[PDB]
Design a protein around this ligand. Structure first.
Ligand SMILES: CCCN[C@@H](CC[C@H](N)C(=O)O)C[C@H]1O[C@@H](n2cnc3c(N)ncnc32)[C@H](O)[C@@H]1O
Ligand SMILES: [Zn+2]
Ligand SMILES: [Zn+2]
Ligand SMILES: [Zn+2]
Length: 235
């Protein structure tokens, strides 16, 4: 029987959320953040005219030199306000809902049809060095945590959404996924977001290939239900 669901603005009210959580209508409480917290040149697109914008033309589309290198434009973009290549900065997230799944805990699902290569959410959290990361793997193992929230960012940068993050921390694993991670440069700094890899029909769960290093721990069985399921989680 289909579990409860909630919208992303429900996580904005901490008092109502802690109450919903007590009744199992929302996931367990966490610190909601909109940007990563660290524990320790313009493109050549020709500006669109007032007529071109009114006509529906795309500013900094697929041929944008910044977009092509997975770099977001700044406020100085030649297209200014029109620039469609500032999705992370403008929080131009896909319309998704947080749902209770049968056996994987909470998950994410499309609340509208999502075209292929659509920006879903940024994966936010506490950014750790390799030392802090290993310390937290051991602490989470000791505390018998069930769910994993680490995401590789770059050398000596691992995002941990265990304690602080956003609703991207709820994306589940699938052996036949419909999303992927992409690393994007924003103001000379690397960020990671989820993107659909195919058309995602409304009401479908959003999934990705959760590539995590299993550090000699007992294998977690995978409940993705895919015909080609690998049976276990982790890379
Ligand atoms: C990139 C961040 C991912 N964070 C967790 C998702 C949210 C979680 N469901 C929650 O409610 O907080 C990942 C955890 O969800 C579980 N999960 C994910 N996919 C599967 C699967 N296919 N089979 C069985 N278990 C799975 C598993 O415990 C995994 O460690
Ligand atoms: Zn451009
Ligand atoms: Zn631009
Ligand atoms: Zn699977």
């Amino acid at each position: 029987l289909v579990g409860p669901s909630c919208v992303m603005d429900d996580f904005r009210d901490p008092q109502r959320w802690k109450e919903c959580a007590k009744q199992g209508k929302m996931p367990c409480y966490f610190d909601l953040i909109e940007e990563n917290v660290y524990l320790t040149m313009q493109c050549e697109c020709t500006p669109l005219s007032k007529d071109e914008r009114a006509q529906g033309e795309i500013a900094c589309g697929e041929d944008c030199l910044n977009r092509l290198l997975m770099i977001e434009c700044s406020s100085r973009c030649p297209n200014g306000d029109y620039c469609s290549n500032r999705r992370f900065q403008r929080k131009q997230h896909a319309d998704v809902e947080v749902i209770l799944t049968e056996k994987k805990g909470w998950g994410l699902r499309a609340a509208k049809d999502l075209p292929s290569n659509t920006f879903v959410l940024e994966y936010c959290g506490e950014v750790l060095d390799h030392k802090e990361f290993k310390a937290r793997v051991k602490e989470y193992a000791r505390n018998k945590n069930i769910h994993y929230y680490f995401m590789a960012l770059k050398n000596d940068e691992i995002i941990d959404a265990t304690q602080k993050g956003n609703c991207s921390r709820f994306m589940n694993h699938s052996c036949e996924p419909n999303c992927e991670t992409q690393k994007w440069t924003v103001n000379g700094q690397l960020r990671v977001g989820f993107f659909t890899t195919k058309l995602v029909p409304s009401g479908s769960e959003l999934t990705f290939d959760y590539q995590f290093q299993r550090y000699g721990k007992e294998a977690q069985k995978c409940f993705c239900g895919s015909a080609n399921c690998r049976g276990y989680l982790g890379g």
